[PDB]
Amino acid sequence: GSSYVNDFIDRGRVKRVYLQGRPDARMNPDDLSKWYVRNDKGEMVPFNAFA
Amino acid sequence: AKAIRQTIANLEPFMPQGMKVVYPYDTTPVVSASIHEVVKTLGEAILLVF
Amino acid sequence: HFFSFKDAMVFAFAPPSVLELGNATGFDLFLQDQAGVGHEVLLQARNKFL
């Protein structure tokens, strides 16, 4: 969803900083499984387990 | 429209290289041509009656 | 007399006729920079103009 974190100044104007995945890791339903979410103990859990 | 063209006239000497400002869409010259056409037809109506 | 206060530029002046307009009198202008040239360029231009 291209989240909005904070701002930054450049060349005399305050603009903004966005944060989103690659143009190559959201393009089809096979690439919604490249994203991993952290467990409660440091392990990594894919989206294939629960989505 | 006159104030927008004046603001672009005050902002044009600080363009970068090769930075032209063009006006692709504008609905003001139809208004100017319409008022000029009706004042012109007023003028030739007075001239033809005279 | 305030030149005997040697450490500070003590600058005394009278108010204008009406006080609603300004605190100084005369003229006023701002040197600005649309190009985004920074602050050192702008302060050098201010002290050059002075």
Swiss-Prot record, chain B:
Q: Which residues cross the membrane?
A: 38-50
Effects seen without this gene? Disruption of MexA, MexB and OprM significantly reduces active efflux of N-(3-oxododecanoyl) homoserine lactone/3-oxo-C12-HSL/PAI-1, but not N-butyryl homoserine lactone/C4-HSL/PAI-2.
Cysteine disulfide partners in this protein: none
Q: Which domain of life is it from?
A: Bacteria
According to its UniProt record, where is this protein located?
Cell inner membrane
Explain what induces or represses this protein's expression.
Answer: By growth under severe iron limitation.
The family assignment reads: Belongs to the resistance-nodulation-cell division (RND) (TC 2.A.6) family.
Indicate the quaternary assembly: Component of the MexAB-OprM multidrug efflux complex, composed of six MexA subunits forming a hexameric tube, binding to a MexB trimer, which interact with the trimeric OprM outer membrane channel protein. OprM is thought to not directly contact MexB; instead, MexA joins MexB and OprM by forming a funnel-like hexamer anchored to the inner membrane. MexA may initially form a hexameric ring complex with MexB prior to OprM, then OprM undergoes a conformational change as it contacts MexA, allowing the periplasmic gate to open.
- Any miscellaneous information on file? Pyridopyrimidine derivatives, such as ABI-PP, are not exported by the MexAB-OprM efflux pump, bind tightly to a MexB hydrophobic pocket and so potentiate the activities of antibiotics such as erythromycin.
What does this gene product do?
A: The inner membrane transporter component of the MexAB-OprM efflux system that confers multidrug resistance. Functions as the major efflux pump for n-hexane and p-xylene efflux. Has been shown in one study to be involved in the active efflux of the autoinducer N-(3-oxododecanoyl) homoserine lactone, thereby playing an indirect role in quorum-sensing; but has been shown in another study not to be involved in efflux of this autoinducer. Over-expression of the pump increases antibiotic and solvent efflux capacities. Implicated in the secretion of the siderophore pyoverdine.
What is the protein name for this chain?
Answer: Multidrug resistance protein MexB
